[PDB]
Write an enzyme that holds these catalytic residues in place. Structure first.
Site, PDB file in Angstrom:
ATOM      1  N   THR A  28     -53.032  18.835 -41.049  1.00 41.65           N
ATOM      2  CA  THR A  28     -53.856  19.715 -40.233  1.00 41.65           C
ATOM      3  C   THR A  28     -55.214  19.900 -40.905  1.00 41.65           C
ATOM      4  O   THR A  28     -55.289  19.950 -42.136  1.00 41.65           O
ATOM      5  CB  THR A  28     -53.149  21.063 -40.051  1.00 41.65           C
ATOM      6  N   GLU A  61     -51.399   9.950 -48.103  1.00 38.51           N
ATOM      7  CA  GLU A  61     -52.781   9.536 -47.885  1.00 38.51           C
ATOM      8  C   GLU A  61     -53.235   8.540 -48.941  1.00 38.51           C
ATOM      9  O   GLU A  61     -54.099   7.698 -48.667  1.00 38.51           O
ATOM     10  CB  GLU A  61     -53.713  10.745 -47.868  1.00 38.51           C
ATOM     11  N   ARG A 111     -61.587  20.721 -44.258  1.00 43.32           N
ATOM     12  CA  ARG A 111     -60.638  21.810 -44.461  1.00 43.32           C
ATOM     13  C   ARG A 111     -60.662  22.248 -45.920  1.00 43.32           C
ATOM     14  O   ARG A 111     -60.895  21.438 -46.822  1.00 43.32           O
ATOM     15  CB  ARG A 111     -59.218  21.384 -44.039  1.00 43.32           C
ATOM     16  N   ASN A 999     -43.607  21.263 -39.881  1.00 39.16           N
ATOM     17  CA  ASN A 999     -44.751  22.168 -39.928  1.00 39.16           C
ATOM     18  C   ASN A 999     -45.915  21.631 -39.104  1.00 39.16           C
ATOM     19  O   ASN A 999     -46.527  22.364 -38.318  1.00 39.16           O
ATOM     20  CB  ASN A 999     -45.190  22.387 -41.376  1.00 39.16           C
TER      21      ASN A 999
HETATM   22  C1  LIG Z   1     -49.614  26.732 -29.126  1.00 36.25           C
HETATM   23  C2  LIG Z   1     -48.836  27.978 -29.546  1.00 36.25           C
HETATM   24  C3  LIG Z   1     -49.802  29.005 -30.128  1.00 36.25           C
HETATM   25  C4  LIG Z   1     -48.258  28.582 -28.269  1.00 36.25           C
HETATM   26  O1  LIG Z   1     -49.333  28.758 -27.333  1.00 36.25           O
HETATM   27  P1  LIG Z   1     -49.062  29.384 -25.777  1.00 36.25           P
HETATM   28  O2  LIG Z   1     -50.081  30.455 -25.505  1.00 36.25           O
HETATM   29  O3  LIG Z   1     -47.603  29.700 -25.629  1.00 36.25           O
HETATM   30  O4  LIG Z   1     -49.400  28.068 -24.900  1.00 36.25           O
HETATM   31  P2  LIG Z   1     -48.689  26.624 -24.781  1.00 36.25           P
HETATM   32  O5  LIG Z   1     -49.466  25.817 -23.783  1.00 36.25           O
HETATM   33  O6  LIG Z   1     -48.527  26.071 -26.166  1.00 36.25           O
HETATM   34  O7  LIG Z   1     -47.224  26.907 -24.206  1.00 36.25           O
HETATM   35  C5  LIG Z   1     -46.624  26.098 -23.203  1.00 36.25           C
HETATM   36  C6  LIG Z   1     -45.230  25.754 -23.693  1.00 36.25           C
HETATM   37  O8  LIG Z   1     -44.301  26.619 -23.028  1.00 36.25           O
HETATM   38  C7  LIG Z   1     -43.853  26.029 -21.827  1.00 36.25           C
HETATM   39  N1  LIG Z   1     -44.664  26.269 -20.634  1.00 36.25           N
HETATM   40  C8  LIG Z   1     -45.309  27.564 -20.466  1.00 36.25           C
HETATM   41  N2  LIG Z   1     -45.371  27.831 -19.135  1.00 36.25           N
HETATM   42  C9  LIG Z   1     -44.805  26.808 -18.436  1.00 36.25           C
HETATM   43  C10 LIG Z   1     -44.607  26.575 -17.091  1.00 36.25           C
HETATM   44  N3  LIG Z   1     -45.019  27.480 -16.172  1.00 36.25           N
HETATM   45  N4  LIG Z   1     -43.997  25.428 -16.711  1.00 36.25           N
HETATM   46  C11 LIG Z   1     -43.586  24.522 -17.619  1.00 36.25           C
HETATM   47  N5  LIG Z   1     -43.763  24.715 -18.935  1.00 36.25           N
HETATM   48  C12 LIG Z   1     -44.374  25.866 -19.339  1.00 36.25           C
HETATM   49  C13 LIG Z   1     -43.785  24.547 -22.179  1.00 36.25           C
HETATM   50  O9  LIG Z   1     -42.464  24.135 -22.559  1.00 36.25           O
HETATM   51  C14 LIG Z   1     -44.804  24.349 -23.286  1.00 36.25           C
HETATM   52  O10 LIG Z   1     -44.133  23.762 -24.401  1.00 36.25           O
HETATM   53  P3  LIG Z   1     -44.002  22.176 -24.651  1.00 36.25           P
HETATM   54  O11 LIG Z   1     -44.812  21.539 -23.547  1.00 36.25           O
HETATM   55  O12 LIG Z   1     -44.577  21.952 -26.030  1.00 36.25           O
HETATM   56  O13 LIG Z   1     -42.522  21.890 -24.552  1.00 36.25           O
HETATM   57  C15 LIG Z   1     -47.706  27.627 -30.538  1.00 36.25           C
HETATM   58  O14 LIG Z   1     -46.745  26.731 -29.936  1.00 36.25           O
HETATM   59  C16 LIG Z   1     -48.207  27.163 -31.892  1.00 36.25           C
HETATM   60  O15 LIG Z   1     -48.486  27.988 -32.752  1.00 36.25           O
HETATM   61  N6  LIG Z   1     -48.312  25.848 -32.080  1.00 36.25           N
HETATM   62  C17 LIG Z   1     -48.775  25.137 -33.275  1.00 36.25           C
HETATM   63  C18 LIG Z   1     -50.258  25.450 -33.516  1.00 36.25           C
HETATM   64  C19 LIG Z   1     -50.926  24.557 -34.545  1.00 36.25           C
HETATM   65  O16 LIG Z   1     -51.820  23.791 -34.206  1.00 36.25           O
HETATM   66  N7  LIG Z   1     -50.533  24.619 -35.822  1.00 36.25           N
HETATM   67  C20 LIG Z   1     -51.053  23.846 -36.955  1.00 36.25           C
HETATM   68  C21 LIG Z   1     -49.902  23.305 -37.805  1.00 36.25           C
HETATM   69  S1  LIG Z   1     -49.699  24.183 -39.383  1.00 36.25           S
HETATM   70  C1  LIG Z   2     -51.318  15.988 -50.034  1.00 38.01           C
HETATM   71  C2  LIG Z   2     -50.990  16.614 -48.672  1.00 38.01           C
HETATM   72  N1  LIG Z   2     -50.774  15.818 -47.642  1.00 38.01           N
HETATM   73  C3  LIG Z   2     -50.487  16.313 -46.436  1.00 38.01           C
HETATM   74  C4  LIG Z   2     -50.405  17.719 -46.267  1.00 38.01           C
HETATM   75  C5  LIG Z   2     -50.083  18.370 -44.870  1.00 38.01           C
HETATM   76  N2  LIG Z   2     -48.736  18.795 -44.701  1.00 38.01           N
HETATM   77  C6  LIG Z   2     -48.233  20.085 -44.854  1.00 38.01           C
HETATM   78  S1  LIG Z   2     -46.641  20.293 -44.558  1.00 38.01           S
HETATM   79  C7  LIG Z   2     -46.538  18.706 -44.203  1.00 38.01           C
HETATM   80  C8  LIG Z   2     -45.222  18.066 -43.783  1.00 38.01           C
HETATM   81  C9  LIG Z   2     -43.976  18.999 -43.849  1.00 38.01           C
HETATM   82  O1  LIG Z   2     -42.839  18.198 -43.483  1.00 38.01           O
HETATM   83  P1  LIG Z   2     -41.516  18.376 -44.323  1.00 38.01           P
HETATM   84  O2  LIG Z   2     -41.756  17.916 -45.743  1.00 38.01           O
HETATM   85  O3  LIG Z   2     -40.399  17.564 -43.743  1.00 38.01           O
HETATM   86  O4  LIG Z   2     -41.146  19.924 -44.321  1.00 38.01           O
HETATM   87  P2  LIG Z   2     -40.722  20.740 -43.019  1.00 38.01           P
HETATM   88  O5  LIG Z   2     -41.940  21.383 -42.383  1.00 38.01           O
HETATM   89  O6  LIG Z   2     -40.093  19.813 -42.018  1.00 38.01           O
HETATM   90  O7  LIG Z   2     -39.736  21.801 -43.424  1.00 38.01           O
HETATM   91  C10 LIG Z   2     -47.729  17.987 -44.303  1.00 38.01           C
HETATM   92  C11 LIG Z   2     -47.858  16.494 -44.011  1.00 38.01           C
HETATM   93  C12 LIG Z   2     -50.645  18.521 -47.387  1.00 38.01           C
HETATM   94  N3  LIG Z   2     -50.580  19.944 -47.262  1.00 38.01           N
HETATM   95  N4  LIG Z   2     -50.930  17.933 -48.566  1.00 38.01           N
END
Ligand SMILES: CC(C)(COP(=O)(O)OP(=O)(O)OC[C@H]1O[C@@H](n2cnc3c(N)ncnc32)[C@H](O)[C@@H]1OP(=O)(O)O)[C@@H](O)C(=O)NCCC(=O)NCCS
Ligand SMILES: Cc1ncc(C[n+]2csc(CCOP(=O)(O)OP(=O)(O)O)c2C)c(N)n1
Ligand code: SF4
Ligand code: SF4
Ligand code: SF4
Ligand SMILES: [Mg+2]
Ligand SMILES: [Mg+2]
Lengths: 1169, 390, 194
Positions: A28, A61, A111, A999
């Site tokens: 991310t 990476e 980031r 994650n």
């Molecule tokens: C996105 C998030 C904030 C939720 O947001 P939200 O306001 O609920 O809006 P979304 O569009 O995501 O929700 C729609 C979800 O609910 C359902 N959905 C909501 N209303 C629906 C409807 N009327 N009909 C069908 N599906 C619907 C769907 O299943 C969809 O999930 P899916 O398509 O992934 O299966 C949350 O899922 C999240 O935190 N995601 C990860 C965020 C991220 O980028 N993290 C970084 C990684 S560390």
């Molecule tokens: C060096 C580095 N590469 C990539 C990332 C991004 N990153 C955070 S968690 C994650 C993967 C987590 O997967 P997993 O090890 O299976 O744990 P889980 O979330 O499924 O419990 C990655 C790729 C990072 N933080 N640092």
């Protein structure tokens, strides 16, 4: 054409067209670039070479960077996407790629770097850490510029042979959605230097015209050879400049190496880089129109730094400059861009006062009010240098004071905030609302989204804008024309109406009548509604959703209501566009589900109600504060304000300098997000404590109490006589914590009683009752019981030391760690890899690991993603060193005139200092005798006893536990884990195998099984699952065990205790069901049982101690599967989506997966026979 | 006593005395430090804690850096030895070690980075690539200074909680044998801040007084939390200065954050770092005796860069300065030390013509004839900037 | 990185020149160093046994793995090289390479590799995934019964005799562990072949 995209897609759009191979690794916020590039390849998008892009996912990476270098040197144009820690792991290869003059583009979603703490949010720390690699560096400030400057970088790198880092601000630009002009692939190929591409092919490694590259050189020629590339770096600025003119002829948009905006006779100019330039230019327009002589220099080409092109755009009238750096280099004289500006101005004798500042670290807000504070500091008699903006630094006094708030938004720009829950669709609806406006109006549209750190059930805030003028407001909404609340529970929690414009619209979802609004709404909210004369609307979106059967999905109901009141486009046309987005977004769910959402649009218009409020609401009085509670200082000053969305008000003096946080703070959250909670049936309970074992949040526990302790018990605290000779004459009760329960329903599914002793009841019906029950059960005194901890029932009578984490409802990971804390949490230290286990395990300011009544609990630490095994290995070395210092002080105590009882305990401890039970036994005797012994000593003898008292925390033997996900153990950290296990150290490695990168959204891993579909594996994973357990058994002295809690409770207990008691390396691979599998989390425990019963997951234990006894070390705990393998795969979406995506190849992979499970099973049978 | 050692042994001598654990991974020319530290442990040499140093070899330098971080966080004073590509693989962990304010010393035999080609020989490319990690950076110019400044770094890191990179020129200093004054272990323990060591033990990860470190933070508090460590970096230059006076009282040798040598009324001064300072000071003596008004500024504490201590040793008569960088950053406006000198001189309104140059890449020769060519360019009507010598 | 490349299934040929030390940098300890051998960073001798790289790569099933030694068998090296290259997939060749850091007379470098296989010190095997597709056993053990003494081979190299000169009391303990580990490794290859 005009399309509404985000920065990542805009970058991926250009990168896909210009590249043949792209090696990637997810992180991310850069992983979406590789995600959409993988999807395009699966659907056959052609690049300018007429072929599909080949996406290769590596183990890290570092592996990605090496593959780029090899692919480039072998003759294929290659790109990659990364950020933050990932970019650091590419830096060694970047020196080679730049040094060998290979054309290449790294796209970076800038980031923050992990320093005192991890931050997935945006700043320039990553890009600045590679500024000495020899890569060129080009910055995009807006979604439009991500599109344009990515093309500039790909075109320039072919001409200059100097590799480019094209970077844009993470989240602030990579995740900002904007309506932009998209450049067609046909136009790009018309701008490509095809002569340069063919020449690059000729330099490829090929046996028919061989050469040698990358030699080793002595001091005689290394310096000269390093300077021989100088003409290429001297010519790059001119090449980028001419490429920027090609883009101008195609797009009409003129970029330069350094761009100027502001008064032609300005005296105060800001130099900055990235998305801040949009905010600064917006403020400069506002200030120049008011008569101020200010300007802005946008840095596009940061490396190579062309002094000529910088001074070319600097007005001769400029007298003071403030340089803004979105990074921090501790101890440095100044931040990188600041030293560059100061140098070039010195090299040309300009007498201009320059001052540098820091901003926007970890996506810290940077709004126009701050930009004026920077300009006003330049206007001061003595401008402060080395300053910060956006924080209150009451310690080192570097922060500028934001004196006044200004509104620099162009007139005619509509502004909206949307408060929604997780999984209710608010964010998805506003993504499509932007597509509706941008695709069907002359207006520019912009949308930025705020999500919680929690995995599910968290608050989401959506900021939208659209106006006739281009949208440079790269900041959160200051003054909102409309505010919508899609969850009534937020009413009274958060200041929803902050900055609402007078006469603005307020949209609410609730079941409250216009009369009930006087009681349910807070006084300050009713005051703002009446004072600012707001148009207040309300709709019962919940009832509309249940009448049609949509469930909790209310976005379509609220989205329809939005266009109805906002009057952005005529409502007749708006409703047509909403019905169209239902098919394009929710089409893949069903044909019946669409007609149920279509009827929701019509009933939403008719159920919208404008609330006529009494004008006397302006004089409403705040409620009387109930009797305040005496909470700890940290909970009061840190945890509460952050959860109340006011963390940005906290000054620098609030925080520790090393990112150290207290333990046991999640018990203060009491989120109460459950729809249903288990209700205990005392007549049906067999007192087995299995419900406490499987609870992913420790929200349900058994309680024992003497009959006297039930004095002040509520009438509903019904008890039963305790079964078992250990708890004879005691009372038993299964009590749930209503405010911490998540409503997953796993405890009720596992309950093995004849009649279910747990039934799911709605929370609101029993919340008042069960709160009083839990509050009494929590205050019960500790009861010493002799139940065997090796059994499930006995283990759950121990206090859990992992409670109320941020994991998903029904998570398959947290039940494992919770059991470990109940067994050895008294004396364990955790080295946790980055991942889900680090996000629900250690997201500030809440810590889910807690202590017992004696104040002892697990110490938790997370270093990096790739080093977790060696991180924990280092701890084991140190803990052994601390015990060695104590044993020396104890051996010297034997020679001192001390009590005979003290000498007896010391001799007993020295013999069993490496035994868990014995070191606790004799250690506690030493701890008990120390205070009386110190009182009776004097001189150097007293100092010896005082040195033992200083180290008494190392009498009890510790238990080092290295916890991480399968992504860490199977890929990026496997090399480090292999070394730690091979070393023989006494560490316990627990691998939470979710078979995906849970994650980061669910990407492919070596732990992913055959045929499963995940991100970066759109067509399904062809290669079979890597057998981590089998390779670790090859050493012979490493304890390896494969467990699954849902499959066998007794097998998990034995493997955990045997592995911890083993004086050596132990490896536990645990199956953890996850939402990325695509299953109903209510039956999360049931899914693990079906996994073992179908031959999908093995259960085995490798004990090296059995080999020393002449026996077979390998024990196969499940030999004959009884369930169908094909039926288990179809119970999870991660396998059924393969039939929906690639149907013809799907049947081939299912046969391979079932054959691989039988070959793996028969291989375990040979080792057992 | 007087013993004939090389830079590596001089560094290992101090590092062995001051450390309990040392995780290592071999790379020329830094691996001899870990080789002799392993041999001493096998023969039972005792450090100031009365125990033998525990040497742990990892699968890479990345594994070494992670183990240092874990060992430090768990309560053991830990060091390591590395260089060049190895130091790069430690950079991700260096952000954590510096960010968590753990006392630590990395001993680096500065070696060129693999760019167009591999080179096992010495320059500052490796050290400069980590100058943004938050580590302090201390440079030794001679075998004697490797001995002294290694002790300064180990003593200062306990007081400031800021980790130190003590680096000296690879081969040119790490492999140069010289007769030097060796500092006894007994004297080092008489200079150790024992209060600081015990406080560092209290911060260790321990189940009987647990805590959480290394959390994940949202944008609301990450910036503030990053600025909360500022007092430690503001105080480090003063701590190194006072530690340098302790070494002076013991050895009679006076070091400062920035040291000056040459004519008191010099008009042309060279700013440089590492072993080149020995060559330049030799040339300055020769030129000053012939009547030339030249001088030299030795950079000891490169990070944190204390503007006060730099200007404190700059004669008021200086009119032109040449800054020498033993590294190359392609496309950059100038090399790292050059931009630092240019900035601080700008921040205090000094009207002094400054020019930067590159030298000694991959152990390229740097002899006094070259030092005069640098001084003579400063004497020209228009000095050439962004130059190379050798 | 090698584990990921071999697991990917690409058509590449990996040749590991196993000298059991870091030969370039002076002869430091490695996971390929055998039990009891003395090298830099292992002054008291390596306690842990040699990591079996070939055995772990065979766990994938689709990776061709072969252990060769030119001094031991000319014909066995030819077959493994041609079979691994013709294999349309990942191939791993672990070759025993005598080195000066072993402490032997380089005139008999080829002879030292023959004594290594004959004493059970170095195995000769070939894992062919194509044999599994033909219904046959993929693992072939090319040397089943050693004929030379294991203790006599170790004393022919300085990297094992210097242990008796440095730590004499611990030296006799490690020689017994090294010979027992070679028999347990040999019988494990016999189970896969039988
Ligand atoms: C996105 C998030 C904030 C939720 O947001 P939200 O306001 O609920 O809006 P979304 O569009 O995501 O929700 C729609 C979800 O609910 C359902 N959905 C909501 N209303 C629906 C409807 N009327 N009909 C069908 N599906 C619907 C769907 O299943 C969809 O999930 P899916 O398509 O992934 O299966 C949350 O899922 C999240 O935190 N995601 C990860 C965020 C991220 O980028 N993290 C970084 C990684 S560390
Ligand atoms: C060096 C580095 N590469 C990539 C990332 C991004 N990153 C955070 S968690 C994650 C993967 C987590 O997967 P997993 O090890 O299976 O744990 P889980 O979330 O499924 O419990 C990655 C790729 C990072 N933080 N640092
Ligand atoms: S699982 Fe059911 S029977 Fe067992 S303790 Fe819980 S409520 Fe009682
Ligand atoms: S429903 Fe889930 S979270 Fe709630 S008590 Fe049961 S297992 Fe725990
Ligand atoms: S592992 Fe899966 S279920 Fe558990 S918290 Fe992470 S995403 Fe949610
Ligand atoms: Mg996972
Ligand atoms: Mg070797």
């Amino acid at each position: 054409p005009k399309q509404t995209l985000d920065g990542n897609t805009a970058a991926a759009h250009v990168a896909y067209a210009m590249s043949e191979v792209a090696t990637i690794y997810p992180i991310t916020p850069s992983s979406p670039m590789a995600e959409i590039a993988d999807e395009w390849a699966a659907h056959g998008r052609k690049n300018i070479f007429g072929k599909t892009l080949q996406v290769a996912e590596m183990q890290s990476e570092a592996g990605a960077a090496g593959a780029v270098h090899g692919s480039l040197a072998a003759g294929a144009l290659t790109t990659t996407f990364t950020a933050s820690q990932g970019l650091l792991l590419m830096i060694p290869n970047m020196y080679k790629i730049a040094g060998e003059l290979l054309p290449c583009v790294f796209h970076v979603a800038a980031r923050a770097l992990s320093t005192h703490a991890l931050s997935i949010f945006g700043d320039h720390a990553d890009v600045m850490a590679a500024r000495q690699t020899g890569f060129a560096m080009l910055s995009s400030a807006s979604v439009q510029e991500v599109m344009d400057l990515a093309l500039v970088a790909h075109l320039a790198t072919l001409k200059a042979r100097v590799p480019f880092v094209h970077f844009f601000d993470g989240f602030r630009t990579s995740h900002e959605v904007q309506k932009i002009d998209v450049i067609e692939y046909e136009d790009m190929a018309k701008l490509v230097d095809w002569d340069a591409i063919r020449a690059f092919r000729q330099r490829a490694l090929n046996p028919e015209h061989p050469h040698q590259r990358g030699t080793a050189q002595n001091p005689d020629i290394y310096f000269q050879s390093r300077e021989a590339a100088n003409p290429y770096y001297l010519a790059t600025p001119g090449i980028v400049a001419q490429v920027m003119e090609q883009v101008a002829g195609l797009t009409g948009r003129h970029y330069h190496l350094f761009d100027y905006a502001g008064a032609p006779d300005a005296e105060r100019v800001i130099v900055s880089m990235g998305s801040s330039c949009e905010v600064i230019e917006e403020t400069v327009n506002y200030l120049v129109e008011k008569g101020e002589k200010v300007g802005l220099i946008k840095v596009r080409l940061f490396r190579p730094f062309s002094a000529e092109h910088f001074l070319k755009v600097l007005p001769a009238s400029v007298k003071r400059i403030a340089v803004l750096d979105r990074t921090k280099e501790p101890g440095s004289l100044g931040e990188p861009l600041y030293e560059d500006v100061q140098t070039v101005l010195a090299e040309h004798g300009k007498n201009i006062l320059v001052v540098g500042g820091r901003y926007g670290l970890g996506s810290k807000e940077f709004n126009p009010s701050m930009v004026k504070a920077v300009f006003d500091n330049l206007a001061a008699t003595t401008p402060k240098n080395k300053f910060t903006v956006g924080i209150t630094d009451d310690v080192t006094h570097t922060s500028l004071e934001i004196k006044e708030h200004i509104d620099t938004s162009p007139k005619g720009t509509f502004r909206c905030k949307f408060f929604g829950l997780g999984s209710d669709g608010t964010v998805g609806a506003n993504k499509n609302s932007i597509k509706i406006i941008g695709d069907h109006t002359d207006m520019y549209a912009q949308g930025y989204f705020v999500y919680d750190s929690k995995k599910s059930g968290g608050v989401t805030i959506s900021h939208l804008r659209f106006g006739k003028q281009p949208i440079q407001s790269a900041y959160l909404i200051d003054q909102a024309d409309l505010i919508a609340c899609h969850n009534p529970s937020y009413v009274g929690r958060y200041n929803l109406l902050e900055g609402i414009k007078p006469g603005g619209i307020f949209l609410l979802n609730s079941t409250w009548s216009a009369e009930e609004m006087d009681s349910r709404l807070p006084a300050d909210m009713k005051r703002t509604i009446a004072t600012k004369k707001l148009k207040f609307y309300n709709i019962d979106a919940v009832k509309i959703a249940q009448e049609i059967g949509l469930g909790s999905r209310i976005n379509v109901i609220m989205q329809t209501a939005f266009f109805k009141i906002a009057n952005v486009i005529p409502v007749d046309e708006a409703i047509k566009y909403i019905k169209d987005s239902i098919v394009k977004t929710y089409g893949k769910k069903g044909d019946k589900i669409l007609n149920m959402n279509f009827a929701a649009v019509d009933r939403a218009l008719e159920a919208l109600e404008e609330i006529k409020y009494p004008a006397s609401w302006a004089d409403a009085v705040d409620e009387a504060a109930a009797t305040v509670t005496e909470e700890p200082e940290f909970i009061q000053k840190v945890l509460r304000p952050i959860n109340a969305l006011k963390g940005d008000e906290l000054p620098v003096s609030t925080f520790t300098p090393d990112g150290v946080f207290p333990v046991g703070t999640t018990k203060y959250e009491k989120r109460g997000i459950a729809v249903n909670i288990p209700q205990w049936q005392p007549e049906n309970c067999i007192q087995c404590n299995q419900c406490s074992l499987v609870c992913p949040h420790a929200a349900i526990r058994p309680y024992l109490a003497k009959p006297a302790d039930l004095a002040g018990a509520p009438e509903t605290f019904v008890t039963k006589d305790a079964i078992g000779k250990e708890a004879a004459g005691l009372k038993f009760r299964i009590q749930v914590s209503p405010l911490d329960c998540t409503g997953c329903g796993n405890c009720a599914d596992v309950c093995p009683a004849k009649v279910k002793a747990l039934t799911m009841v709605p929370l609101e019906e029993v919340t008042a009752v069960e709160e009083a029950n839990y509050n009494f059960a929590e205050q019960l005194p500790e009861v010493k019981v002799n139940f065997n901890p090796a059994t499930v029932k006995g283990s759950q009578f121990r206090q859990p030391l992992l409670e109320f984490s941020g994991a998903c409802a029904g998570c398959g990971e947290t039940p494992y760690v919770k059991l470990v804390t109940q067994l050895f949490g008294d004396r364990m230290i955790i080295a946790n890899a980055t991942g889900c286990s680090s996000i629900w395990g250690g997201s500030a300011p809440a810590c889910p690991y807690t202590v017992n009544r004696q104040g002892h609990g697990p110490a938790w630490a997370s270093s990096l993603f790739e080093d977790n095994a060696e991180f924990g290995y280092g701890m084991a070395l140190a803990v052994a060193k601390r015990q060695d210092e104590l044993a020396t002080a104890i051996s010297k105590a034997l020679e001192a005139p001390v009590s005979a009882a003290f000498k007896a305990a010391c001799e007993g401890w020295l013999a069993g200092k490496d035994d868990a039970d014995r070191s606790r036994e004799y250690g506690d005797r030493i701890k008990a005798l120390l205070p009386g012994e110190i009182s009776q000593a004097s001189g150097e003898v007293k100092d010896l006893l005082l040195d033992i008292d200083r180290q008494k925390d190392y009498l009890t033997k510790k238990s080092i536990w290295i916890i991480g996900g399968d992504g860490w153990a199977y890929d990026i950290g496997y090399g480090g884990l292999d070394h730690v296990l091979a070393s023989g150290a006494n560490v316990n490695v627990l691998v939470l195998d979710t078979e995906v990168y849970s994650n980061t959204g669910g990407q492919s891993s070596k732990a992913t099984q055959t045929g499963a579909v995940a991100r970066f594996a759109a067509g399904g994973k062809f290669t079979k699952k890597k057998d981590l357990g089998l390779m670790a058994m090859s050493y012979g002295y490493v304890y390896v065990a494969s467990v699954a809690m849902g499959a066998s409770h007794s097998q998990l207990m034995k493997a955990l205790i045997e592995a911890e008691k083993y004086d050596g390396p132990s490896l536990i691979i645990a199956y953890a069901p996850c939402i990325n599998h695509g299953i109903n989390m209510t039956y999360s425990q049931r899914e693990a049982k079906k996994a073992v019963e179908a031959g999908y997951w093995p259960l085995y234990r490798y004990n090296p101690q059995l080999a020393q006894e002449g026996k077979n070390p390998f024990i196969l705990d499940y030999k004959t599967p009884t369930a169908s393998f094909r039926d288990f795969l179809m119970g999870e979406i991660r396998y059924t989506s393969l039939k929906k995506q690639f149907p013809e190849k799907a049947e081939q992979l299912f046969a391979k997966a079932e054959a691989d499970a039988k070959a793996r099973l028969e291989q375990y049978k040979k080792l057992a026979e």
